[PDB]
Design a protein around this ligand. Structure first.
Ligand code: CA
Ligand code: CA
Ligand code: CA
Ligand code: CA
Ligand code: CA
Ligand code: CA
Ligand code: CA
Ligand code: CL
Lengths: 204, 229
């Protein structure tokens, strides 16, 4: 009987652990599993400065809890070193942690305020202005579409490119200025987020 | 319409994993499952790779299949190459609307036990006083990184030292022991006698700690122990 050392048995050590960035602080993200053939009392730990800022471990149960919010937009992959000890040996093993994205950002407009002077004789179909908004979520969640709320019979906006065109003959005498509201939305399937911006069009 | 959005359910990123040193042409992702067709008579979408740093990934847009491209090189997780993961974007352009969606792909690269321990020196040495009592530590030269080291990660890179039987010095593994294999310090187990024997050749084998015993790798050194007087 030399001491048998314990070993982790979590399947994730072979692959990776996926954790959603909306996991709340204090939630349990997994439970460490280890075996010691002596059946020695085991003590679980986390090691690393980076890792111990984000996770804590219950020492007897091996429940791993989140210490502070994950943010997929800041950091989407961590390497975490976990430890298990029988008080004669500290065994360590690394897991790759993958942060899952949620749609948690609305689009942000750039180059505001938006304002453009055009002559009353601007032909139909003429491009007059380009709005721009960006959105750092993954995938459909980060893909911006533009529209006018509500649509205008005098101006259209290209949904993908944010280019404003004249679609109706203008008339200074009828209308001197339009205040349009541009909606930029992401395309998240179930929880789209959008944001509004003002576009002033001044007729000459 | 919805072309360029994911056809599958689940989260936005397409995350997969793969062992280091995998064959050229390994299928990383069998089907990206993006709505639309990049091929055929009337393609509704365009697919291409972005941020394909060093071209590790190749795309077939019609099948929406991603492949490892390692012809003439190896995907190495260990130093000096240190490839722990590969991130690419599958850019999808909706041809009709102009919409652009980036489908991020993340490839976790797993460590293989493909390296053996190496000892810093070709052999090691201690001198011992014949009256040194049993239980005394007589050699600590494997401390620091002056012993064996291994460039793999985790347990594949950790070391255990085990004295081996030596058919050229049958008594050496009786006279000395390593009680704590993770340290490799050698302790005197039997009384010495300068009148009978002045030198021991102790064979010390370093092994790494791979999960499975039969993928462990080992390396041998000799500790020569001279008695003083
Ligand atoms: Ca034990
Ligand atoms: Ca976030
Ligand atoms: Ca978003
Ligand atoms: Ca997000
Ligand atoms: Ca390697
Ligand atoms: Ca390796
Ligand atoms: Ca190794
Ligand atoms: Cl994700």
């Amino acid at each position: 009987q030399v001491n048998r050392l314990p070993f982790f048995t979590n399947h994730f050590f072979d692959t990776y652990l996926l954790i959603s960035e909306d996991t709340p602080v204090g939630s349990s993200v997994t439970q460490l599993l280890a075996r010691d053939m002596d059946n020695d009392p085991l003590v679980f730990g986390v090691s690393g400065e980076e890792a111990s800022r984000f996770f804590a471990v219950e020492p007897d149960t091996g429940v791993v809890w989140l210490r502070q919010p994950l943010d997929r937009e800041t950091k989407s992959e961590f390497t975490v070193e976990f430890s298990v000890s029988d008080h004669q040996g500290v065994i360590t093993r690394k897991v790759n942690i993958q942060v899952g994205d949620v749609n948690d950002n609305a689009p942000t407009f750039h180059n505001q305020p938006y304002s453009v002077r055009i002559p009353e004789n601007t032909p139909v179909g003429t491009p007059i202005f380009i709005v721009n908004a960006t959105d750092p979520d993954l995938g459909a969640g980060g893909s911006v579409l533009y529209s006018f709320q509500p649509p205008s019979p005098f101006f259209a906006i290209d949904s993908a490119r944010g280019i404003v065109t004249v679609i109706q003959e203008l008339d200074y005498e009828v209308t001197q200025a339009y205040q349009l509201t541009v909606n930029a939305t992401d395309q998240d399937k179930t929880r789209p987020l959008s944001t509004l911006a003002n576009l002033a069009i001044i007729i000459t | 319409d919805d072309d360029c959005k994911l056809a599958r359910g689940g989260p936005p990123a397409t995350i997969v994993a793969i062992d280091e040193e995998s064959r050229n042409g390994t299928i990383l992702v069998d089907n990206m499952l993006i709505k639309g067709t990049a091929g055929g008579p009337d393609p509704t979408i365009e697919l291409s790779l972005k941020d394909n740093v060093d071209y590790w990934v190749l795309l077939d847009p019609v099948k929406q299949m991603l492949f490892l491209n390692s012809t003439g090189r190896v995907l190495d997780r260990d130093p000096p190459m240190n490839i722990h993961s590969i991130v690419v974007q599958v850019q999808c352009v909706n041809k009709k609307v102009g919409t652009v969606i980036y489908h991020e792909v993340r490839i976790v690269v797993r460590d293989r036990n493909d390296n053996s321990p190496t000892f810093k020196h070709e052999s090691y040495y201690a001198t011992v006083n014949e009256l040194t009592p049993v239980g005394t530590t007589i050699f600590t030269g494997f401390s620091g990184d002056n012993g064996a080291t291994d460039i793999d990660d985790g347990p594949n890179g950790q070391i255990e030292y085990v004295i081996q039987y030596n058919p050229e010095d049958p008594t050496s593994n009786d006279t000395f022991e390593i009680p704590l294999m993770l340290t490799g310090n050698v302790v005197l187990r039997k009384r010495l006698n300068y009148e009978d024997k002045t030198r021991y050749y102790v064979i010390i084998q370093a092994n790494d700690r791979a999960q499975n015993l039969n993928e462990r790798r080992t390396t041998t050194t000799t500790l020569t122990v001279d008695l003083e007087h």
